[PDB]
Design a binder for this molecule. Structure first.
Ligand SMILES: Nc1ncnc2c1ncn2[C@@H]1O[C@H](COP(=O)(O)OP(=O)(O)OP(=O)(O)OP(=O)(O)OP(=O)(O)OC[C@H]2O[C@@H](n3cnc4c(N)ncnc43)[C@H](O)[C@@H]2O)[C@@H](O)[C@H]1O
Ligand SMILES: [Zn+2]
Length: 215
């Protein structure tokens, strides 16, 4: 199964990805995680992406497309994958469509996780993330068992720099401008499914799982 998670900042993509890969055991491919690993590794590409990410701006398409192309060509992506936060732009969706054709593959579903703006801001304001594994929590909506500690591994929780309200505003601005072009691209392709992301975590997954389980 070849799946795309799309959604505005805060919509619950990573949270749902954790649920999906637990049940289905396809690899989780996140462009955000790939950029963060390039940053940890200190590469030229990583260092160049960092300024965009800190500002809540999209990394330019050319770089992003090249890293996804390389990742998805690996042997572990040939029996299914979960793409999370790619494509974010019609140019990226165009390129992925070519890339997939060259691999003899196509998308099963693009899951558009829908959430109201106010809720998106409430979610990003209360978010804490494990520095080790990247699991995400929310002070109100999904707290860790003990404050400041990841439930899975005992890791330290941190606040992402781009979660500051002024940066969140820029992220929603920049990403909303891309939503309707992306929806139009995939509505045509017959793969788009809207998911009500504004429910309890496990109940959003009920809806996603209904789709995935039928594949
Ligand atoms: N393709 C691309 N092209 C160009 N640039 C790219 C790119 N991909 C990445 N980039 C660059 O990298 C940056 C970061 O990208 P990326 O890391 O992909 O971040 P993002 O797209 O902004 O999404 P978030 O991680 O903020 O949100 P999420 O939807 O996964 O929410 P979460 O599950 O954590 O949940 C959020 C909060 O809500 C809580 N929560 C989750 N679900 C629920 C629920 N159902 N109810 C209540 N709370 C919930 C969580 O606990 C958490 O606290 C980009 O801004 C850009 O600079
Ligand atoms: Zn952790």
């Amino acid at each position: 199964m070849n799946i795309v998670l799309m959604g505005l900042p805060g919509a619950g993509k990573g949270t749902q990805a954790e649920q999906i890969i637990e049940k289905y055991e396809i690899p989780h491919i996140s462009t955000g995680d790939m950029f963060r690993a390039a940053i940890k590794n200190g590469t030229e590409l990583g260092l160049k992406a960092k300024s965009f990410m800190d500002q809540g701006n999209l990394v330019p398409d050319e770089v992003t497309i090249g890293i996804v192309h390389e990742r998805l060509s690996k042997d572990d992506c040939q029996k299914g994958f979960l793409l999370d936060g790619f494509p974010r732009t019609v140019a990226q969706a165009d390129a992925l469509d070519s890339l997939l054709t060259d691999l003899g593959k196509k998308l099963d579903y693009v899951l558009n996780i829908k959430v109201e703006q106010e809720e998106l801001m409430k979610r990003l304001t209360g978010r804490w993330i494990c520095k080790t594994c990247g699991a995400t929590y929310h002070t109100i909506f999904n707290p860790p068992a003990v404050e400041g500690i990841c439930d899975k591994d005992g890791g330290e929780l941190y606040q992402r720099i781009d979660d500051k309200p002024e940066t969140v505003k820029n992220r929603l601005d920049v990403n909303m401008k891309q939503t309707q072009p992306l929806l139009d691209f995939y509505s045509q392709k017959g793969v788009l499914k809207d998911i009500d992301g504004q429910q309890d975590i496990k109940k959003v997954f009920v809806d996603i799982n209904d789709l995935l389980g039928g594949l």
